[PDB]
Amino acid sequence: QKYLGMLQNGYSDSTSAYVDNISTGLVVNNESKLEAYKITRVKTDDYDK
Amino acid sequence: NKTKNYIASVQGHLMNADYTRRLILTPVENNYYARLFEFPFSPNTILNT
Amino acid sequence: YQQDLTMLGRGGVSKNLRTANSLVGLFLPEYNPALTDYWQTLRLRLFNL
Amino acid sequence: RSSSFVKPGSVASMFSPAGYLTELYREAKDLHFSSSAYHLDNRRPDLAD
Incomplete structure (x- = not known):
């Protein structure tokens, strides 16, 4: 999870999605290509309050 | 079952009911395309069918 | 739930x-913390040996 | 749910401090009427959230 974070596979509706990264495979729905994406977050200016 | 041509499966637990579950038989494993049998778990969220 | x-x-x-x-x-x-303590002890004993 | 066991020290545990806190709030919430300033949700409205 230090490399890949959390995989988007339909958790409960709140659940957050970052540990501290989010990634999943997404077959692009305009064609027949299967992409893997990754987003990383750096908490900024008073995120914890 | 040889006399009626059935395949019977038995399971103890499932790890998530929101995931789609089929039954894969494969001589190789690690490779989804090498399979010889695949059945969708008929109601899902089910074991021993 | 009840x-x-x-x-x-x-x-x-x-x-x-x-x-x-x-x-x-x-x-x-x-x-059960008692069962996980058995595994922790066995892991530690095998490491030292 | 029946197989989603958690390690001790997790907030999700039924025996975790969160579980104890939930029981305390559940029973101590109504020790006073809403009319009284001594009501738990009146003196500390942040607790409910």
Whole structure:
């Protein structure tokens, strides 16, 4: 999870999605290509309050 | 079952009911395309069918 | 939750089977600390040997 | 749910401090009427959230 974070596979509706990264495979729905994406977050200016 | 041509499966637990579950038989494993049998778990969220 | 447990104790009706994970604010069972202590000790003993 | 066991020290455990805190709030919430300034949700409205 230090490399890949959390995989988007339909958790409960709140659940957050970052540990501290989010990634999943997404077959692009305009064609027949299967992409893997990754987003990383750096908490900024008073995120914890 | 040889006399009626059935395949019977038995399971103890499932790890998530929101995931789609089929039954894969494969001589190789690690490779989804090498399979010889695949059945969708008929109601899902089910074991021993 | 208590109503479901009461019905389950006699019947077993599962109309609308899956309980819609967003319908949970309940806590989850916890592992036995005595059993996990056995594994921790065995891991430590094997490491030293 | 029946197989979603958690390690001790997790907030999700039924025996975790969160579980104890939930029981305390559940029973101590109504020790005073809403009319009284001594009501738990009146003196500390942040607790409910």
